[PDB]
Amino acid sequence: RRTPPLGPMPNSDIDLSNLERLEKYRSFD
Amino acid sequence: DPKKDQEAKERLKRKIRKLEKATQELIPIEDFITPLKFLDKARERPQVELTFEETERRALLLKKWSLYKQQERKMERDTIRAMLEAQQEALEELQLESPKLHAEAIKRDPNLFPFEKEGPHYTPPIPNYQPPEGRYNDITKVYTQVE
Amino acid sequence: YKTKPTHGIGKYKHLIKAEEPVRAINLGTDYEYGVLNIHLTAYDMTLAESYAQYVHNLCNSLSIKVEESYAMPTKTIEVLQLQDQGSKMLLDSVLTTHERVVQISGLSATFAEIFLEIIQSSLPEGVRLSVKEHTEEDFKGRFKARPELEELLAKLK
Amino acid sequence: GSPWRLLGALCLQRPPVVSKPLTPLQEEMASLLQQIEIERSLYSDHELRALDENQRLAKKKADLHDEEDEQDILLAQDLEDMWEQKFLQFKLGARITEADEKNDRTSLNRKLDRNLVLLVREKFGDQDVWILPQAEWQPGETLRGTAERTLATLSENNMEAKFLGNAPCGHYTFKFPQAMRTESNLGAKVFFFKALLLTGDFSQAGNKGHHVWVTKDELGDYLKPKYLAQVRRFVSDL
Amino acid sequence: DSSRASLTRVHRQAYARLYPVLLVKQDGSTIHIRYREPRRMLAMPIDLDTLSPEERRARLRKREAQ
RNA sequence: AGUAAGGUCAGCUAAAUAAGCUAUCGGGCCCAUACCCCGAAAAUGUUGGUUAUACCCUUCCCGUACUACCA
């Protein structure tokens, strides 16, 4: 059984198709 | 023959398979490896402390160098942008005029590569130059993989 | 929890490239080129390394992926000259050839013209630029030769 | 068809032959880097040879304890003299040639440290207008191919050019004057393609009135103000 | 620009001193390279083994009859 | 149907620096052959894993071995 989220989930704006071309953090700060 | 010729070839294949599946060693780069002759302390030149004026001159020069290279990057970055804007605008105009020619324009060039270009020389070649007579001998060390 | 609306909030591996362990050469499409090797040949070691660093940084600013940066083995060639009024060759100087290769991929066909124009305009003096498509032979040329494998192969021939 | 006339232009460019002279700021930086390199470098064999030779002279003059007579025939400082003499005898090529002195804007031997762009003079409506080489597109031929055909149509040239890519580097659209402006031929759409001049040059039949080679800075003298602006976009002066 | 990445230095912890020399090529062109010894100029001789056999003899004839 | 165990020079054994013997090749001895003498060459069943390997484990295969009982 599942329930849809009440709002926008985290990391939903991340485009997984171009994950290779997406800029990474590369640093802790 | 059946127990000698056939068995010999089977064992040769086994040795080939072991060597083919074995890891391959990279050729070492002499540039990165420090020769042991440099480790000798006899080659260590004495160190002379720079004067206060000398250090101040270098520090100001480096500060001016940062701005100079930043302006060089700006000119290069704008040069790339200027070319990109013109090329993209040209492609849009070409597509409107003739879609068929636009399709061929955006295709890759098989004859583009290999692309070879030599750097400019310090001086132009002499129109009438006679180089001396000599021979080129290659003494590059050959590295072989064993075991 | 599964039934709660906050299910899956902690998922993170879908944001990470799958790293689940030589390298297959990816040929380009009709609009993009494949893996390219940018050879940099010069008689000065500093010039070859410095320009390879410049090319590597240029690709990052241009959002061009760099597959690998590596150095080819140094070639050392003796330079001999004929003595005056003599037939004997005498050594004059020793010249070392240093090659730096920067491997890029995913270059656009339209953007290739701009990329090649920029790098050739910045080529230092005494440095030779050669851009070639990556092939298996070039990669295999970085490894030590195996005479033992050759000797066994000669028997099979 | 279309009212506009398809034209394929070739932007043939001569790469610089010699390196650009260093700026006064770069000269200071170049000396510092050379100075820093010497400071952090170890003693070379030539330097070690000179130091030992100086010690041998001291070991031969202060005390008569040297047990070797031959030693070395030539000293390190003496060996530098032979190299210096040979360098003076050798004459380097002239970076600034006779073309620069005479302002001969036809030969390729001018401004070896700059970039030259080929320009030709064509007469349209009894009017001489300086434009880049171009040709009209023909059926069964790519737009880039027309530019390649333009090179073959030049006046007795054996030049070899290396085209970069297939997409055009720029475009220039103009309309014919209203005197001859018609619906069938409203105007033309020029497309530019850049190439690198590897080898070759024009013959000595016609030089002054046929073609000129100028840099981007002096490119405005020949091109029209509207035509110059489009050319200055895809032509760099790095 | 040829000076975009030309002003460099040896990026090594331990390295012998290198001197700026001119490498004269077979066509008379010269380039700035570093060499172990402070030789003001270096000339690359034309390889006599790479010429055609007929042209080698013609060059030898020019050498003779001094 | 189960379980044990073995797989190595051409051959057969020993050791895991993979050797010895015979066989094998080359030479000498002898009118000739063989014996003999000198010298050379020649292998880990296979799979993969064992820091890394081998003698180990393990995949697979050939052959071998024992058991398959009481109503």
Side-chain angles (χ1 to χ4, degrees):
Chain A
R1 181 167 60 94
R2 293 293 183 271
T3 302
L6 303 177
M9 292 297 299
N11 313 327
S12 61
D13 300 326
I14 303 299
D15 186 11
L16 301 182
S17 62
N18 294 325
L19 190 59
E20 166 63 32
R21 296 180 180 269
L22 286 185
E23 179 184 354
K24 307 305 183 303
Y25 283 108
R26 304 183 308 275
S27 59
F28 179 83
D29 297 4
Chain B
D1 295 1
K3 296 300 182 179
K4 181 61 179 301
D5 302 329
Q6 178 67 21
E7 297 292 335
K9 299 180 178 180
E10 294 179 358
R11 290 181 287 97
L12 293 181
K13 294 184 178 180
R14 297 181 177 92
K15 300 180 181 181
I16 293 184
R17 291 175 179 176
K18 184 176 183 179
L19 297 184
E20 288 288 345
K21 298 172 184 178
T23 170
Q24 304 177 358
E25 298 182 356
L26 290 171
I27 301 178
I29 308 303
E30 301 181 0
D31 304 335
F32 300 142
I33 302 180
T34 301
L36 195 140
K37 53 181 298 181
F38 299 157
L39 184 59
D40 186 11
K41 301 181 180 181
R43 296 183 180 269
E44 298 179 0
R45 65 179 62 256
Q47 301 180 359
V48 181
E49 297 182 358
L50 303 179
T51 58
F52 177 83
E53 300 178 356
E54 181 66 25
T55 58
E56 181 177 2
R57 183 186 63 88
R58 297 188 176 189
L60 299 182
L61 180 54
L62 293 179
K63 293 183 177 183
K64 299 183 298 179
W65 185 250
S66 304
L67 184 57
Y68 176 74
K69 298 299 294 183
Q70 181 177 355
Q71 297 176 355
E72 282 196 348
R73 185 65 184 97
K74 180 177 176 58
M75 297 179 60
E76 176 180 346
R77 179 174 58 258
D78 297 357
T79 298
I80 303 179
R81 176 186 58 183
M83 292 183 177
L84 186 56
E85 293 178 356
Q87 182 184 12
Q88 293 296 334
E89 189 178 359
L91 285 178
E92 298 170 2
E93 189 71 21
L94 179 60
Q95 181 183 5
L96 299 180
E97 175 71 16
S98 62
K100 300 181 180 180
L101 296 183
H102 177 66
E104 302 292 337
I106 59 183
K107 293 180 181 180
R108 57 184 292 186
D109 184 15
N111 302 336
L112 178 59
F113 300 100
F115 174 76
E116 300 180 4
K117 175 57 184 174
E118 299 185 356
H121 309 128
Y122 177 60
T123 54
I126 298 180
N128 292 335
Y129 177 81
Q130 296 185 356
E133 298 180 353
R135 181 190 58 179
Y136 295 101
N137 178 24
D138 200 333
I139 59 163
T140 303
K141 301 180 181 179
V142 179
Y143 300 92
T144 60
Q145 183 179 6
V146 289
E147 178 183 4
Chain C
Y1 194 72
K2 292 183 175 182
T3 68
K4 300 306 165 177
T6 57
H7 174 55
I9 188 181
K11 297 183 178 179
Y12 63 95
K13 284 198 175 183
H14 63 87
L15 302 174
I16 286 298
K17 177 196 307 176
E19 302 176 359
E20 303 176 1
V22 179
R23 181 185 178 94
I25 300 179
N26 186 28
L27 300 185
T29 62
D30 201 9
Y31 309 95
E32 297 182 1
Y33 295 98
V35 193
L36 297 180
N37 300 334
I38 300 184
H39 299 261
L40 295 178
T41 299
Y43 293 93
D44 192 6
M45 179 185 58
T46 64
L47 295 179
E49 298 183 357
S50 177
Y51 194 62
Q53 174 180 349
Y54 167 83
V55 174
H56 196 168
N57 291 271
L58 180 60
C59 297
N60 300 331
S61 299
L62 294 179
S63 302
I64 298 181
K65 181 177 184 178
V66 182
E67 297 287 338
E68 184 182 2
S69 176
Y70 58 90
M72 295 300 298
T74 301
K75 297 180 177 179
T76 304
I77 300 180
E78 287 184 348
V79 178
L80 295 82
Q81 296 186 349
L82 185 55
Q83 59 180 0
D84 298 328
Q85 296 183 354
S87 57
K88 292 184 175 183
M89 293 300 181
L90 305 180
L91 177 64
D92 185 20
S93 60
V94 179
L95 299 184
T96 58
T97 299
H98 312 273
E99 181 182 358
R100 293 298 183 272
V101 176
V102 174
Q103 194 176 38
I104 69 177
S105 63
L107 179 60
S108 179
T110 63
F111 193 73
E113 184 270 349
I114 302 180
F115 178 76
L116 294 180
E117 181 66 24
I118 300 303
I119 58 177
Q120 73 95 357
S121 183
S122 300
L123 193 61
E125 58 179 4
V127 185
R128 177 181 175 91
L129 169 61
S130 183
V131 190
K132 302 178 179 180
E133 300 180 350
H134 177 48
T135 56
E136 302 181 0
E137 302 179 355
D138 302 328
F139 181 75
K140 292 180 181 181
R142 303 167 54 183
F143 299 93
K144 302 176 179 179
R146 291 173 292 184
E148 299 177 353
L149 185 60
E150 302 173 358
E151 291 176 358
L152 301 175
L153 188 62
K155 302 176 179 178
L156 183 54
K157 296 177 179 179
Chain D
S2 60
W4 304 91
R5 299 175 58 181
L6 279 180
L7 295 177
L10 167 63
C11 180
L12 182 63
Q13 297 181 349
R14 186 214 65 174
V17 183
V18 304
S19 60
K20 183 177 182 181
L22 300 178
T23 66
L25 181 56
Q26 285 179 357
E27 293 180 349
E28 308 175 9
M29 184 60 182
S31 299
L32 178 57
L33 290 177
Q34 182 58 227
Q35 181 176 354
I36 291 180
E37 177 182 348
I38 297 178
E39 293 176 357
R40 301 180 179 181
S41 61
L42 298 180
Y43 275 153
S44 60
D45 298 0
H46 181 72
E47 286 182 327
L48 288 178
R49 177 180 180 179
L51 294 179
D52 300 1
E53 287 171 354
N54 299 335
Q55 296 175 2
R56 291 182 181 180
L57 299 179
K59 293 178 64 178
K60 192 59 179 297
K61 181 256 181 180
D63 290 327
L64 296 180
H65 195 48
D66 188 10
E67 298 294 334
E68 300 184 13
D69 176 72
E70 300 183 357
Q71 297 285 354
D72 290 352
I73 291 296
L74 303 179
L75 300 180
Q77 176 61 28
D78 191 11
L79 186 58
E80 298 182 4
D81 302 331
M82 295 180 60
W83 296 335
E84 201 276 342
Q85 292 180 354
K86 297 302 181 181
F87 182 77
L88 300 184
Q89 301 177 4
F90 185 77
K91 181 178 180 61
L92 298 174
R95 296 177 56 86
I96 292 89
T97 65
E98 188 179 4
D100 299 319
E101 305 175 2
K102 204 172 303 304
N103 197 90
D104 185 11
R105 293 189 176 181
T106 308
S107 61
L108 294 169
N109 202 19
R110 63 175 307 267
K111 293 186 178 300
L112 306 180
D113 56 330
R114 300 293 299 273
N115 195 328
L116 298 182
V117 179
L118 174 58
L119 290 184
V120 298
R121 181 171 58 185
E122 299 291 343
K123 197 171 190 180
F124 306 107
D126 302 332
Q127 182 179 2
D128 301 0
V129 178
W130 292 92
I131 60 177
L132 282 72
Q134 65 177 13
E136 184 177 353
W137 183 90
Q138 300 182 357
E141 183 180 4
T142 59
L143 189 62
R144 174 188 165 187
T146 300
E148 306 183 14
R149 181 177 55 91
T150 306
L151 177 61
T153 55
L154 299 183
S155 63
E156 196 66 26
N157 62 322
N158 49 23
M159 301 184 305
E160 300 180 354
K162 174 61 178 181
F163 287 78
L164 299 177
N166 302 329
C169 305
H171 78 282
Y172 177 77
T173 64
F174 66 99
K175 287 187 172 185
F176 299 151
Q178 194 183 355
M180 63 162 297
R181 182 174 299 185
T182 54
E183 299 177 356
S184 59
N185 298 331
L186 177 60
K189 292 181 176 178
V190 185
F191 291 91
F192 304 95
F193 294 84
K194 295 179 58 176
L196 298 179
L197 181 55
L198 303 180
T199 43
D201 192 1
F202 293 88
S203 295
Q204 299 294 335
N207 297 326
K208 300 175 182 178
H210 291 60
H211 63 278
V212 291
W213 296 81
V214 288
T215 65
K216 183 178 181 178
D217 302 355
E218 53 184 359
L219 193 69
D221 301 330
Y222 302 87
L223 303 186
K224 294 297 183 178
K226 290 302 178 182
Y227 188 81
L228 172 70
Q230 299 297 331
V231 178
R232 287 180 55 87
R233 297 168 64 178
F234 56 88
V235 173
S236 60
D237 197 6
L238 303 178
Chain E
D1 191 11
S2 60
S3 62
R4 184 62 172 87
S6 66
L7 306 186
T8 82
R9 71 177 186 90
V10 181
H11 290 67
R12 295 297 187 272
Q13 298 296 335
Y15 63 96
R17 181 180 180 179
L18 296 177
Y19 304 91
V21 317
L22 293 178
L23 184 63
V24 185
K25 298 183 180 179
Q26 304 177 4
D27 57 352
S29 57
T30 60
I31 55 181
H32 278 87
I33 63 170
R34 293 176 173 87
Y35 189 73
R36 52 178 63 172
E37 302 177 359
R39 307 182 62 177
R40 278 74 178 182
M41 71 171 184
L42 296 181
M44 296 195 308
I46 171 181
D47 195 0
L48 304 184
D49 302 357
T50 56
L51 299 181
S52 65
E54 304 183 11
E55 288 177 350
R56 299 179 190 180
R57 299 183 177 184
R59 181 178 302 274
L60 290 181
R61 296 182 181 185
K62 299 179 180 180
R63 296 183 57 180
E64 303 181 6
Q66 297 177 359

